[PDB]
Amino acid sequence: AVVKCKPTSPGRRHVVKVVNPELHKGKPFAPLLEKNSKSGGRNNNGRITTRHIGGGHKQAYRIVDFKRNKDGIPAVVERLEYDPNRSANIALVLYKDGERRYILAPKGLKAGDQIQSGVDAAIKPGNTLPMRNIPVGSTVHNVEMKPGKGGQLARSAGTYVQIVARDGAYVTLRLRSGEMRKVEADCRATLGEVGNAEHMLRVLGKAGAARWRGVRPTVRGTAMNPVDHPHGGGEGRNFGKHPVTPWGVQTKGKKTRSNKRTDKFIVRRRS
Amino acid sequence: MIREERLLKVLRAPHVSEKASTAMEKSNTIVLKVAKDATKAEIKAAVQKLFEVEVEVVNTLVVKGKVKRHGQRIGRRSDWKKAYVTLKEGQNL
Amino acid sequence: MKRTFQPSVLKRNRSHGFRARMATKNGRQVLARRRAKGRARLTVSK
RNA sequence: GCUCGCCGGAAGACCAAGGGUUCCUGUCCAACGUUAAUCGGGGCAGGGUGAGUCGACCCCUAAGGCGAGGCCGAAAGGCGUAGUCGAUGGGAAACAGGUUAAUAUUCCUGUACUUGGUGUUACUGCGAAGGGGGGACGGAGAAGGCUAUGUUGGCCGGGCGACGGUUGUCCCGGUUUAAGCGUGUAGGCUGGUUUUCCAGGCAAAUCCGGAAAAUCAAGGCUGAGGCGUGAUGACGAGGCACUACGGUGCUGAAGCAACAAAUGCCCUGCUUCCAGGAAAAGCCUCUAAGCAUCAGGUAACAUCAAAUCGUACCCCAAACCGACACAGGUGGUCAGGUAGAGAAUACCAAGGCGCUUGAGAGAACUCGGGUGAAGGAACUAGGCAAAAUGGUGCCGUAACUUCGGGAGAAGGCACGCUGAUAUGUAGGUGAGGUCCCUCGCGGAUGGAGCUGAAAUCAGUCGAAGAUACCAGCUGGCUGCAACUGUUUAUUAAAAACACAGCACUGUGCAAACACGAAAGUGGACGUAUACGGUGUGACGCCUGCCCGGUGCCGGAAGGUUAAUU
RNA sequence: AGGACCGAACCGACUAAUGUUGAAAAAUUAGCGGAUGACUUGUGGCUGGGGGUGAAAGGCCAAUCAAACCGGGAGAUAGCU
Ligand SMILES: [K+]
Ligand SMILES: [Mg+2]
Ligand SMILES: [Mg+2]
Ligand SMILES: [Mg+2]
Ligand SMILES: [Mg+2]
Ligand SMILES: [Mg+2]
Ligand SMILES: [Mg+2]
Ligand SMILES: [Mg+2]
Ligand SMILES: [Mg+2]
Ligand SMILES: [Mg+2]
Ligand SMILES: [Mg+2]
Ligand SMILES: [Mg+2]
Ligand SMILES: [Mg+2]
Ligand SMILES: [Mg+2]
Ligand SMILES: [Mg+2]
Ligand SMILES: [Mg+2]
Ligand SMILES: [Mg+2]
Ligand SMILES: [Mg+2]
Ligand SMILES: [Mg+2]
Ligand SMILES: [Mg+2]
Ligand SMILES: [Mg+2]
Ligand SMILES: [Mg+2]
Ligand SMILES: [Mg+2]
Ligand SMILES: [Mg+2]
Ligand SMILES: [Mg+2]
Ligand SMILES: [Mg+2]
Ligand SMILES: [Mg+2]
Ligand SMILES: [Mg+2]
Ligand SMILES: [Mg+2]
Ligand SMILES: [Mg+2]
Ligand SMILES: [Mg+2]
Ligand SMILES: [Mg+2]
Ligand SMILES: [Mg+2]
Ligand SMILES: [Mg+2]
Ligand SMILES: [Mg+2]
Ligand SMILES: [Mg+2]
Ligand SMILES: [Mg+2]
Ligand SMILES: [Mg+2]
Ligand SMILES: [Mg+2]
Ligand SMILES: [Mg+2]
Ligand SMILES: [Mg+2]
Ligand SMILES: [Mg+2]
Ligand SMILES: [Mg+2]
Ligand SMILES: [Mg+2]
Ligand SMILES: [Mg+2]
Ligand SMILES: [Mg+2]
Ligand SMILES: [Mg+2]
Ligand SMILES: [Mg+2]
Ligand SMILES: [Mg+2]
Ligand SMILES: [Mg+2]
Ligand SMILES: [Mg+2]
Ligand SMILES: [Mg+2]
Ligand SMILES: [Mg+2]
Ligand SMILES: [Mg+2]
């Protein structure tokens, strides 16, 4: 559910929360947890290479089964869980032979549901199959770009991909960006949409809410001095320049894709 | 079994002070100056050999040398180890 | 007020100590210069 | 020595860091000490730091570092795998009393505890670089149960008062006791056991996970505190004797209860929220290659060992960082009384200090303050500064509003003491007693004693009762920025920055983009509800026309056009 | 519940006076803002000079910053004093 907070303080006046009370209120499942320390957007030269990253809350990494490789063995959903690492919720599933795993929670899945992967799985949300065994016209998510590599496409909350065509050993996918893209028909996908579609309705309400997420403030280029940024300087407010990145590249319209290796898989750019 | 050559080298001097006199007269402890790298076991074996008294226990400490002057010249006396060796109540060294 | 020199012996030794100097070639060149000058104290170690 | 004054959430006490003899004793007063100095953190000489249990060392890992091979790079070197380091975190064990001029959880006394090495006896499947479990973790909030501690009473010892009174409902003091061991309490968590079986735990496993059964229902874990013991002890108000008048020697009474009570403990609990909250070892357990009436396990006992290094002293400071014996700076721990909401504040305790020039005088003027006739902002750039308001309870409170606010709006009334209600109330606490027993640290009834606000009605003193300290000035119109935040360390705190929100735009993942000759790394163990860039800046109503110029996007016919040939 | 309210510790630094060969190369005193958070603080670590870092003041990078400090080219050059 989506809920507006009452304005008992200015920082709460605009807060809109997305509360899922289906989500397990306890601790995660420990065998599937790793530590992940923060970077502050710094690389192994110790330099900031992505701006505006730092602070925020401590988070453990949940090992999530993006490969969905346990074929023929059904699993039951034990519970849905909050995952701080990603917008989608995750679902702890228990396979019949006793193995527990985490998967991306698709829309509509709840505790008690049965799921399956393989060439024989039934066509229902949460089931994983190669896209040559999935009917053209299906909505899928967690789509592989190479067979056996694991899902890389349509993983974020509420996303999905549509299988629009199949030509021999390749399928044509319509991705959430609007791009039509070729992918080998031997790639696996999970049926349904990714759940938690109300994710995008939340309103942070205050600066500190973005700080909790490890986002540091953005200083506008025009607020700096010429030595700092191409937009810098000028008495009062002045621009008189085509807008650019901090490193001098046009930032309103200029395209930056350059990959002749993967051009052949793009059937139609997103426009 | 520590070597007798090792044992003959670790007891340097007996320490003479009011605290040492009172350790002898109140606790049956003798205060010695021992070799800087002397261990408690070595000091104990050396006293049990060369002074021929039974040793209950050895306590040790390192005295740091003072800074002194000499004709407008700074210098430093050596560190040196002190041992409180306790005898067994009736040994009477 | 807080002045610039705030001592820590660990940080001193890690930053300027004998082994830190020996860890890199430019550090060894520091030690070489200081020996050729005849410093009585090569490093902050002693 | 006697008085006086000052600090007392510190100006007391203990640490860490840092310093390093500044510690204690004798002697000396040249220089040092902003004066003198017989004194000193000064000179000189001597003394002083005692550990199986405290800390380091050690086992273990975090960020991060280094990094055999390796990948990369003119050289130097960069990055990184196996590994190996790295605390600010995890991992065994000791307390009370006494004692030195100067050390003490280290010495002594008394009473404990931990780990390992052996050496026997007894039952004996042990074995890991591998599996599982555990260690193991957030914020906020609520309430109970406690303790530290305090107050009173009882008890014990002492007193009978330099001036009216003081044998009493009078005065003073003391009334302290640990770790450990036994007990498993308030309370928190979990159903327990026993079987068959299995695409999971890189092999295996009797373990873990999963399934299916029968069976039994209180078993298991955790746990403050209390009680018993430790303890006939120690300590102990005082008294007595020496004094080398600095203190030691000897002796020692009471050693109880009730009430109040933490920010400490139970509690790494419980409840709840979203921003979803280390690792590795020690530890338990499972087995593999292997050893197999051998090694090895368990328990008992006996005996060994527990090394080395630190330990003095300062430590919100004259001993550290500031050139100074410098109104500065410096992390942690302890937390008494009266009043008070309080760690504010005032006065005090324990304790520690009077700040290393003094003596006079009592001009201008300067500094820090007190008071002020009449007037009351006339001052001035400006009410700058000052003056003023100030507490609690209750009455009462406007435009407007995003319905939360505005609001402590504004304005007002009461307020000390004594007595009664009620020889101390409402309430809290709760003994003996009686009863019951899933028989105890049990539970019910019982209410003695203790503690105890508020109010109302009378009376009463002062000019004044929130009496000191402490402690909002208030209202009206208007610009700007929504707001809490941030900023020019050292003349600018703002209308500047940020901001949630909005939009454009890039980006299909070996992403765009960024650091990097490169290898790589960040972005991200993310995947378009995502990520980068840019502008705008909550919210409400909105956001019109221009593609000529410049940029960007698309386009591919024609002209122009490089190396090349 | 809250980047909620009042208010100490703690963090800051709005006004005035003093001080300006200071007690102090930035403080003292009286007032002042925040005070459960975008808070504050200890220890250790990483980023290195046309480079870092910057809720952006050209701020800060050891009392030094529109290009740190040390050493070197180096006795730069100086139609100027
Ligand atoms: K500007
Ligand atoms: Mg950004
Ligand atoms: Mg933004
Ligand atoms: Mg500017
Ligand atoms: Mg430029
Ligand atoms: Mg302008
Ligand atoms: Mg213009
Ligand atoms: Mg020692
Ligand atoms: Mg000296
Ligand atoms: Mg002294
Ligand atoms: Mg003299
Ligand atoms: Mg003098
Ligand atoms: Mg001296
Ligand atoms: Mg001993
Ligand atoms: Mg590492
Ligand atoms: Mg390396
Ligand atoms: Mg190599
Ligand atoms: Mg190690
Ligand atoms: Mg540590
Ligand atoms: Mg002492
Ligand atoms: Mg008590
Ligand atoms: Mg508190
Ligand atoms: Mg000491
Ligand atoms: Mg002084
Ligand atoms: Mg001072
Ligand atoms: Mg105070
Ligand atoms: Mg005067
Ligand atoms: Mg005056
Ligand atoms: Mg006046
Ligand atoms: Mg007047
Ligand atoms: Mg008047
Ligand atoms: Mg008037
Ligand atoms: Mg006027
Ligand atoms: Mg005038
Ligand atoms: Mg004023
Ligand atoms: Mg005033
Ligand atoms: Mg105007
Ligand atoms: Mg503002
Ligand atoms: Mg503000
Ligand atoms: Mg300034
Ligand atoms: Mg500042
Ligand atoms: Mg200012
Ligand atoms: Mg990559
Ligand atoms: Mg605006
Ligand atoms: Mg703007
Ligand atoms: Mg607040
Ligand atoms: Mg402080
Ligand atoms: Mg002040
Ligand atoms: Mg405020
Ligand atoms: Mg406040
Ligand atoms: Mg500076
Ligand atoms: Mg330059
Ligand atoms: Mg030259
Ligand atoms: Mg010259």
Author numbering:
A (entry chain c): 2 to 272
B (entry chain s): 1 to 93
C (entry chain 1): 1 to 46
According to the publication:
Ribosomes synthesize natural proteins by catalyzing amide bond formation between an l-α-amino acid and an l-α-peptidyl oligomer linked as esters to the 3′ termini of A- and P-site tRNAs, respectively. The reaction occurs within a region of the 23S ribosomal RNA (rRNA) called the peptidyl transferase center (PTC). Here using cryogenic electron microscopy (cryo-EM) we determined high-resolution structures of the wild-type E. coli ribosome in complex with full-length tRNAs acylated with each of the three aminobenzoic acid monomers—Apy, oABZ, and mABZ—and accommodated within the A-site of the PTC. Our structures reveal that, although the ribosome is capable of accommodating aminobenzoic acid derivatives within the A-site cleft, the distinct sp2-hybridized backbone of these monomers and their positioning within the PTC fail to trigger the conformational changes associated with the induced-fit mechanism.
Meanwhile, oligomers containing meta-aminobenzoic acid (mABZ) were barely detected by mass spectrometry. The A-site mABZ-NH-tRNAPhe complex with the ribosome, meanwhile, was refined to a global resolution of 2.3 Å. This resolution permitted modeling of the mABZ monomer in one of two conformations related to a 180° rotation about the aryl–carbonyl bond. In the case of the mABZ monomer, the aromatic ring could be modeled in two distinct conformations that differ in a 180° rotation about the aryl-carbonyl bond. In neither mABZ conformation is the nucleophilic amine positioned to attack the P-site fMet carbonyl, as it is pointed away from the P-site fMet and separated from the reactive carbonyl by a distance of either 6.2 or 7.0 Å. The position of the A-site mABZ monomer within the PTC with respect to both distance and orientation is consistent with the low reactivity observed in vitro. Taken together, the orientation and longer distance between attacking amine and carbonyl carbon seen when the A-site contains mABZ versus Apy, oABZ, or a natural α-amino acid are consistent with the diminished reactivity of mABZ in in vitro translation reactions. In the case of mABZ, these factors, combined with the fact that the nucleophilic amine is pointed away from the P-site, render this monomer virtually unreactive. The directionality of the nucleophilic amine is reminiscent of the case of d-α-phenylalanine, for which a recent crystal structure revealed that the A-site amino group is also pointed away from the P-site carbonyl carbon resulting in the slower peptide bond formation of this enantiomer despite the ribosome PTC adopting the induced state. The pKa value of the acidic (ammonium) form of mABZ was found to be 3.5.
